Design a protein around this ligand. Structure first.
Ligand code: ADP
Ligand code: ADP
Ligand code: MG
Ligand code: MG
Lengths: 448, 48, 481, 464
């Protein structure tokens, strides 16, 4: 047992008897005049322990008893976590417990393509097993619809579960997500962790660890490819800066914490593929001042494999998913990892779409007439390629009407091969709209 | 035909100019923040 | 009992008070109040909520045994009060037994419902493009003299929903002029005015938003709808910065404390739309932030932007150029969107945003007249006229049925024949005509919340007839071709 | 002697006792975690922790080792993966080596050096030709993320099949594993030591990682053997030192860095040198890396390292995306040693190669004479392009450059230059091995060999 000495915002100093001082990052409970969870930070001296509060420190008094758990903040793990809602501390918000803090595996021991089923992703921006994907999109474009899809597909096909982490989320959006998952009936194969903007910086710091720890057990023990959805990862780094200042650390470049790369490094490295199985992290990343040179987004980009840029222009056309094929990229798109054929087709598709985009300005004024015979055909193919990239989503039954379709890698490669060569020049533009396999193209072609 | 060429290059040059200034702006933006804070924290450490 | 050791700059260190609570109300011996923030090893750092001129070393301070609380009720409606809840207007005392704590936890994840109830500001630009729902948080951000307060006042006038205008770091004469504006419109009767002016200490400015929120929460939990306005959080942030620096808390970015984001977070989150189980009341927020040289990238703006559910960025260049309100369409967003719009507005202003996005892209070409094709020329002529409809005079909120008709006119291309400069007068005279003669069309939109095929054909005939009557101000007149 | 911890936090620890403790002495906490005594105060000892400090508390007992910061060295480290301290992470037994070296050691003096006149072949056409690297030289590899900085270093190590020392600082584990895997495939791991201080590790490890890798290399250097060290990268090691300094409450300067951030990189890189004949005549080549932000060479940390190193190889994003891989900007990139670090064969053929391509890029931006230069230049670019993990021998490079420069590819289309190069080398490898053998031995192209090549090319063109 200890006694509270000093309180200054979310920082609390506690006295303990000489040689019974709690270890660092250990959870300490204290009764409010509710139970407040404090986490140890520094050893001031004379058996004084400076701690960071995980909830508001309003109602505390000097001399109040503080109990030592003798371990870091524990959170629930297993199949019971699925279809539930938790906080950073690991308490049920819908009315074994392992520590959140742990080092990642050694790099020598870590094993050195994640088939989604979507044509646009697999071809142009293929995801990685144990890799880090970034979901760029405007306001109300199609982030949640896509995350629900990735849950649905990998849960159904591969059988692996998912874990969502609302790191400084809007509480309103959390309520919207809950109902969205409830209607789709994908709550059962999804775990939810929430540490919204309302809570102090202490929560937003550790909330990411709690959700990650749960995912790590699904990875290690169950032996399955688990999904980790983080929104937003920047807010962890932001929270890191907030606590850093109050702890009394001198700020670094652009007023960030000096241990920015370290804090991020410890989190991101845990999100990795082991020999047994992998964890695929679909992260959202804020870019302050639209400045990619800013330390926060600059450091994050080092950890990441893939990017998916959703554009409003493609959304306005009615192309779902509205992935920007040019802007979006993936590191693993090389002839070594994925073979020469895939690389050849992928780049050739990009070439056609790029030239189409260049001619938009000329077509806007003059039109198709002024273009050459070759360009006329390229524009025709480009438009058909744009519409073929559209696909039915399993999650989007309420939206579209028709059920979703999953397209293997071999089907994807062969399809775009035939399109580039110009074997489907006779078919209409409507035939390519919202279809999976090549059989469904030909079937819809006859009806029209 | 000559205007097309002339104004095309001008537009390409403008694109390049924007990129150079935008970097210079962000350089200054980050620097000004870093510089102000160091002076503020410097004064704080002076007392205690 | 405790004794003051140090005093100055609205701060006081107190000896004693061994079992004092955090954020507890203390009373100095002159009757001035204080707040125990920092409970140190051998002292208690207290911020003074009042004049500290007769607070000295040796003076005796006592405990109240209460965390900050403020009275609430229907009595506050049409009254002007300070953070503590004392009336300044001078219209008797506030008869209300019910009280609420300033610091209260916001509704949980389960204790909320999705926002699907429009809160009509009465401003065409906002309602159409960036709609605000009941329980939503919409930031109003921009430079000085861009029309931030004007939008909030016009919103309050259009509710003629309980209103709570919180003034932080404002000059007295401004708050008086705002009160005068509400009296003229006749919107003061359902409006509470919390005021923490510049003369007041930092403590008042720091508290001002929390007090205004607490007043609104009383209605929220009872199952009634509220609108709160913070004018502005920029000054409240500056006030907290002052307090923290005086208490010797370590500064961060822009000399602000670590929990400057946390300050705004707890405040804004309390604004929400409750579940059906808890009545189903709401509490809409309109926070304000004062940018410097249109710097959105700044620390405090970015903090509030990341909290709120969309932003309405006002620009100086647009305001001066004649676009009033000066809402930048591209940057401004509504996170709720169509959910906080009636079906009538959703249909007409569905592809208004798309047309104007194309217009701004084209705009460059407009100067070079008749050097383009036909399609682009029509878009420019259409776009230019749409801008004139979005323009709106100060202190003139329009009803939702009047807005839908005005937008329907422009979007369908009924103003294409009329000159651009005469669009504003055409709109005004048209609404007057429909108000008088064709009230059934307005009534239909009010009830059904949609524009019927009958109403469409009715409007077309009404427009055509009016065009013939309408005398064009500039040059000759033109009806149709 | 024994001491007790008074204060602890943020990877720093104040210790009571240890009265006769040395400066920069290795201390051992009671959990087995190590530390370094930096600040010896009046009534305390400021120590930086080289490990996790989660189970380091007030009252815990710390002991002296009686040794100033030092790491074991030898032949045992070859084909092993170790941390800064020198503990194996790969899990392939312990490191049997009695010989040790201090981390902080003075670099060779002015008199204890010899001018660099020994080529270190990277096996990359662009580098070897334009910006050559000699034994003892320091060549900076600088550019944005995903420009191919690491790739160049790995290809260099593969081409040595000279002892290699790949130092990884602030790297993800999976990357270091993939680098190790690449060395195993090529079969270059046997003569390669891998020092690894990944992102998870504390700032201390990142700060130390380069100094440990340098110390390992110095053992070979002083014995009169040649070494190549690779820092990947110093940008993160700088950031690590910034963190430490700010935690210790040292006053920040430009870009929130301490005053001795330049001094940090200076002592490290200078230790890389070419010793005199009196001291064996061993070498220790350096390939430091810096990560620029939006191709900002003007930034503080880049400018610091640029001013230290003996030339730079600036990689560009625009060039990389456009297809030029490696994406070395010819105009900006330089070699300070130059022709001295080139064999006579390469010196002759690639004497005015960098100048011609500098003129090409100028002309590209915008006659008969100018048209020919553009057609020539465009084809030269295709030769400079090189696939990943494919180092070419020096004799193969000189022939490929000789082909382009003299204008043997002018008749052939630009797109078919890459295949022409591959098939040509296969022909010469099979039939005319004597030409390659001549260049290997003599290190020069004879007038006979020139006329031989011309006839071989002409005959092949007909067949092609
Ligand atoms: N839509 C409008 N049309 C015409 N004038 C306006 C409009 N909105 C505001 N104004 C005028 O411009 C001024 C803007 O100042 P103010 O409301 O103080 O902006 P801020 O609150 O952002 O400083 C007001 O005094 C008002 O008279
Ligand atoms: N010579 C080359 N040719 C083609 N691609 C290359 C070459 N060198 C590197 N790359 C590509 O660049 C990517 C990143 O290389 P890397 O050396 O890790 O860059 P960085 O060091 O900037 O991260 C790899 O995925 C690889 O495919
Ligand atoms: Mg105002
Ligand atoms: Mg690299």
């Amino acid at each position: 047992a200890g006694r509270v000495v000093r309180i200054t915002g979310p920082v609390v100093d506690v006295e303990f008897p000489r040689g019974s001082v709690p270890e660092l990052f250990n959870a300490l409970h204290a009764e409010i005049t509710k139970t407040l969870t404090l986490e140890v930070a520094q050893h001031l001296g004379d058996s004084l322990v400076r701690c960071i509060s995980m909830q508001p420190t309003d109602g505390l008094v000097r001399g109040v008893e503080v109990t030592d758990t003798g371990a870091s903040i524990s959170v629930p793990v297993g199949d019971g976590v699925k279809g539930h809602v938790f906080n950073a501390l690991g308490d049920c918000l819908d009315d074994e417990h392992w520590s959140i803090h742990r080092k990642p595996p050694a790099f020598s021991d870590l094993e050195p393509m994640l088939e989604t089923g979507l044509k646009v992703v697999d071809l142009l921006t293929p995801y990685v097993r144990g890799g880090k994907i970034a979901l760029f999109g405007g306001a109300g474009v199609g982030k949640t619809v896509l995350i629900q899809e990735m849950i649905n597909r990998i849960a159904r096909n591969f059988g692996g579960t998912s874990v969502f982490a609302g790191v400084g989320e809007r509480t309103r959006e959390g309520n919207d997500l809950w109902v969205e998952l409830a209607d789709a009936n994908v709550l059962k194969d999804t775990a939810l962790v929430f540490g919204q903007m309302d809570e102090p910086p202490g929560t937003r710091m550790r909330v990411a660890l709690s959700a990650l720890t749960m995912a790590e057990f699904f990875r290690d023990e169950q032996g399955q490819d688990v999904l980790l959805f983080i929104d937003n990862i920047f807010r962890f780094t932001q929270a890191g800066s907030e606590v850093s200042t109050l702890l009394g650390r001198m700020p670094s470049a652009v007023g960030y914490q000096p241990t920015l790369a370290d804090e991020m490094g410890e989190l991101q490295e845990r999100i990795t593929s082991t020999r047994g199985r992998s964890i695929t992290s679909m992260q959202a990343v804020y870019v302050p001042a639209d400045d990619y040179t800013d330390p926060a987004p600059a450091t994050t980009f080092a950890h990441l494999d893939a990017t998916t840029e959703l554009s409003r222009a493609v959304f306005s056309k009615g192309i779902f998913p509205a992935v920007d094929p040019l802007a979006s990229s993936s590191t693993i798109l090389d002839p070594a990892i994925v073979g020469d054929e895939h690389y050849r087709v992928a780049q050739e598709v990009i070439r056609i779409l790029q030239r189409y985009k260049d001619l938009q300005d000329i077509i806007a004024i003059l039109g198709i007439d002024e273009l050459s015979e070759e360009d006329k055909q390229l524009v025709n193919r480009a438009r058909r390629i744009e519409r073929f990239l559209s696909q039915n989503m399993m999650a989007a039954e309420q939206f579209t009407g028709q059920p979703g379709s999953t397209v293997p890698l071999k089907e994807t490669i062969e399809a775009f091969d035939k399109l580039t060569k110009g074997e489907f020049d006779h078919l209409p533009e409507q035939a390519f709209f919202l279809i999976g396999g090549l059989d469904d193209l030909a079937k819809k072609a006859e009806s029209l | 035909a000559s205007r097309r060429r002339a104004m095309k290059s001008a537009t390409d040059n403008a694109d390049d100019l924007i990129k150079a200034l935008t970097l210079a702006a962000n350089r200054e933006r980050q620097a000004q923040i870093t510089q102000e804070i160091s002076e503020i924290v410097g004064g704080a450490n002076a007392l205690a | 009992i405790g004794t003051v050791i140090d005093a100055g700059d609205g701060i006081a260190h107190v000896e004693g008070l061994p079992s004092v609570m955090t954020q507890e109300l203390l009373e100095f011996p002159g009757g001035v109040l204080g707040v125990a923030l920092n409970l140190d090893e051998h002292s208690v750092g207290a911020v003074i909520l009042g004049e500290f001129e007769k607070i000295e070393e040796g003076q005796q301070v006592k405990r109240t045994g209460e965390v900050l609380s403020v009275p609430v009720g229907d009595a506050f409606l049409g009254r002007v009060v300070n953070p503590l809840g004392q009336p300044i207007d001078g219209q008797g005392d506030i008869a209300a037994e019910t009280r609420r704590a300033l610091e209260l936890q916001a509704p949980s994840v389960v204790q909320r419902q999705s926002v699907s109830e429009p809160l009509q500001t009465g401003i065409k630009a906002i309602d159409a493009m960036t709609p605000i729902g009941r329980g939503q948080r919409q930031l109003i951000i921009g430079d000085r003299k861009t029309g931030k307060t004007a939008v909030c006042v016009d919103t309050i006038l259009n509710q003629r929903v309980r209103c709570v205008y919180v003034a932080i770091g404002q000059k007295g004469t401004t708050i008086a002029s705002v009160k005068r504006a509400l009296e003229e419109g006749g919107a003061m009767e359902y409006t509470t005015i919390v005021a923490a002016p510049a003369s007041d200490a930092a403590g008042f400015k720091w508290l001002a938003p929390y007090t205004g929120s607490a007043i609104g929460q009383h209605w929220m939990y009872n199952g009634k709808h509220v609108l709160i306005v913070f004018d502005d959080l920029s000054k409240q942030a500056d006030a907290y910065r002052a307090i923290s620096l005086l208490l010797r808390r370590p500064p961060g970015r822009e000399a602000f404390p670590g929990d400057v984001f946390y300050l705004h977070s707890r405040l804004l989150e309390r604004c929400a739309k409750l579940s059906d189980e808890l009545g189903g009341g709401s509490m809409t927020g309109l926070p304000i932030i004062e940018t410097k040289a249109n710097d959105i990238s700044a620390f405090i703006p970015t903090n509030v932007i990341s909290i709120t559910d969309g932003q309405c960025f006002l620009e100086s260049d647009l305001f001066n150029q004649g676009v009033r309100p000066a809402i930048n369409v591209g940057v401004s967003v509504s996170r709720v969107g169509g959910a906080a719009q009636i079906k009538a507005m959703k249909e007409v202003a569905g592809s208004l945003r798309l047309d104007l996005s194309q217009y701004r892209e084209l705009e460059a070409f407009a100067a070079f007249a008749s050097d383009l094709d036909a399609a682009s020329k029509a878009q420019l002529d259409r776009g230019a006229r749409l801008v004139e409809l979005l323009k709106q005079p100060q202190y003139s909120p329009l009803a939702v049925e009047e807005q839908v008709v005005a937008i329907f006119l422009g979007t369908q291309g009924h103003l294409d024949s009329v000159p651009v400069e005469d669009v504003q007068r055409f709109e005004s005279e048209l609404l007057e005509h429909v108000k008088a003669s064709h009230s059934d069309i307005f009534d239909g939109i009010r009830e059904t919340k949609k524009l019927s095929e009958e109403a469409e054909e009715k409007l077309v005939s009404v427009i055509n007839e009016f065009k013939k009557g309408f005398x064009x101000x500039x040059x000759x007149x033109x009806x149709x071709x």
